[PDB]
């Protein structure tokens, strides 16, 4: 936490880098120094350093080296594309593919390791978990190494590092991850690591994409005669069904308890499941009808420790997304009423809309206000800010809805409106290419530039 001091120390870094791996607390110190300064990471991180770290990990066979290597991939918990690419290249080559414990499915789960003595030991995943629970040097070492390797593999695939995801997914399939997570016999730490790996290697892949709740632009023909509560989801209309079921079941079970955030072992699993749920919701997999019940459960799991604060913040973000979806539904209802008009009755419908099924609560809204008030008294700055924003927003929904209705720009126009559909189709391919030949990108950019008083429209 000293940019000037960090730069001054890094000024003479070659000596520290050279004196790495001699049992002195320098490799960890070096990693800590290059933990926030993205510029420092770019300047001091190269192929040689990654290769040296990999060789040290191979020689020592200790989890600490793997954890230190993994921590370098993410800078300020945001990204490090150059460092991530280098780490993936160094740790994905078949030659180096000996320090990572392989996992397989047999009729269950079995983990195979190469041992420090170049051996080949295969142990049942359930049997290995039972042995670790019993307590043994070999079992404890295997469990720690597996956890560290899973964490490092998940970190390597942070953001969209497809160069490594394409291999990690094949190495550990989504179905295998789901089967492992839904065990309840293995230690909580391993389950949390598996959940994080699944979230960061098979949830944010190419297929899924982010969703914007409040679509400020709507198609005139799209609006139906009347929009029911299910309509907002039926009109919208994937494969990880078991993942969603497990997430819902775990969240419900956590809610149906006293002091839900009490056990650290279960606390980590809850902090992973909440993150998975937030990612799925932001990905649009869930629907509004089920979203209401999910939000009710989440609020119930908050009424009346960094992990606890992070979980509360994630729950608040999910609730904010649900509120945005509700505002979108209200705007859709207003637009549907206007279309039905093709007066004062519309006034009554509007007054009755923002007054009810479309309510994220179970005690007439008192629950949300109580939770927000309780959170406001909390300590964490992000939690306090989120609670204050939510409290100031909830009791002022009418103004926000009116402002949203004042920004809706219908596209009932002629084929000129179809230019909007053409632009959307082009932007789909543009984003697909951006995520991951150049002729198509150049043509799309040229077409967009050509398409871009009509300038304002």
């Amino acid at each position: 936490d000293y940019r000037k001091n960090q730069e001054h120390i890094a000024k003479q870094f070659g000596m520290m880098q050279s004196q790495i791996g001699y049992d002195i607390l320098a490799e960890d110190t070096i990693t800590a120094l290059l933990h926030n300064n993205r510029k420092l990471l770019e300047k001091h991180i190269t192929k040689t350093e990654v290769e040296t770290f990999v060789s040290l990990v191979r020689k020592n066979r200790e989890p600490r080296f793997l954890d230190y290597l993994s921590d370098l991939c993410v800078s300020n918990h945001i990204a490090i594309p150059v460092t991530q690419e280098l780490i993936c290249k160094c740790v994905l080559d078949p030659k180096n593919s000996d320090i990572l414990i392989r996992t397989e499915l047999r009729p269950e789960v079995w983990l195979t390791w190469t041992d420090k003595n170049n051996e080949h030991h295969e142990k049942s995943v359930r049997q290995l978990a039972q042995e670790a629970r019993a307590g043994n040097a070999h079992d404890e070492n295997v469990l720690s190494y597996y956890r560290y390797q899973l964490k490092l593999f998940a970190r390597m695939c942070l953001d969209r590092q497809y160069l490594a995801i394409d291999e990690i997914s094949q190495q550990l399939g989504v179905d295998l991850i789901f089967l492992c997570m839904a065990d309840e016999m293995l230690p909580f730490d391993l389950r949390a690591s598996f959940c994080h790996l699944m979230l960061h290697v098979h949830v944010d892949r190419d297929p899924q994409e982010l969703v914007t709740p409040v679509k400020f632009a709507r198609l005139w023909t799209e609006i139906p005669t009347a929009i029911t509560i299910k309509d907002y989801d039926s009109n919208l209309n994937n494969k990880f069904a078991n993942t969603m079921e497990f997430v819902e079941d775990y969240l419900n079970n956590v809610v149906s308890e006293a002091v839900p955030f009490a056990n650290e072992e279960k606390n980590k699993l809850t902090f992973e499941v909440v993150s998975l749920a937030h990612n799925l919701i932001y990905f649009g997999f869930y629907s509004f009808s089920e979203l209401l019940r999910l939000t009710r459960t989440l609020l119930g799991i908050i009424d009346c420790d960094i992990v606890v604060m992070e979980t509360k913040l994630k729950i608040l973000e999910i609730l904010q997304f649900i509120l945005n979806v509700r505002l979108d539904y209200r705007i859709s209802y207003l637009l549907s009423v206007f279309k039905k008009e093709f007066l004062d009755r519309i006034g009554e419908q509007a007054e009755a809309m923002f007054g009810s099924m479309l309510e994220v609560d179970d005690e007439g809204g008192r629950m949300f206000l109580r939770v927000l008030i309780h959170l406001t008294m909390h300590d964490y700055a992000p939690l306090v800010s989120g609670a204050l924003q939510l409290l100031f927003k909830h009791f002022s929904q009418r103004q926000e809805a009116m402002h949203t209705f004042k920004q809706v720009q219908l596209l009932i126009s002629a084929q000129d409106v179809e230019n909007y559909k053409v632009i959307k189709s082009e932007l789909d391919r543009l984003r697909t290419m951006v995520e991951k030949n150049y002729q198509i990108v150049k043509g799309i950019l040229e077409r967009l530039n050509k398409m871009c008083q009509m300038r304002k429209k």
Partner: protein, 146 residues
């Protein structure tokens, strides 16, 4: 086509109609903030923690050390705090019933009293700290307003 004209007219009429109740909803929120303990379950630890205007002190501290975090949030908090200490008046018979119902559902010399309560919370230090730190027009202006 010309449907845009009809849509804009309907939007304007709806906004004009809703204007009477927007202030009522804001007043309902202000009242809820005025007596936060009234909402939480009586006798609970939150009742004692919030008994001495705990929410007020926490909000004041957050607003003071929140200008850089989000200017909009600080401005909104200051406006709400000023509205709370700014008396009240009939928001229209049309919206009076709505405000009463909202207060009931969300909650099962007076100017001098609330002013003294805010001063005890430490709003004097809040306003002076906002003033003698910031050149942002809205921040300093709203501190003067408070």
């Amino acid at each position: 086509k010309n449907i845009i004209e009809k849509l804009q007219d309907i939007i304007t009429a709806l906004e004009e109609r809703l204007k009477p109740l927007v202030q009522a909803e804001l007043s309902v929120l202000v009242d809820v903030l005025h007596w936060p303990e009234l909402l939480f379950l009586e006798g609970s630890e939150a009742y004692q923690r919030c008994e001495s205007g705990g929410f007020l002190s926490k909000l004041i501290q957050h607003t003071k050390d929140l200008m850089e975090s989000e200017e909009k949030l600080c401005i909104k908090v200051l406006r709400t705090l000023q509205q709370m200490l700014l008396k009240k008046t009939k928001y229209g018979d049309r919206g009076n019933q709505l405000r009463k119902m909202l207060l009931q559902n969300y909650l099962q010399s007076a100017i001098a009293a609330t002013q003294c309560r805010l001063d005890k919370e430490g709003a004097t230090k809040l306003v002076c700290d906002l003033i003698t730190s910031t050149k942002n027009e809205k921040i300093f202006q709203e501190s003067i307003g408070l």
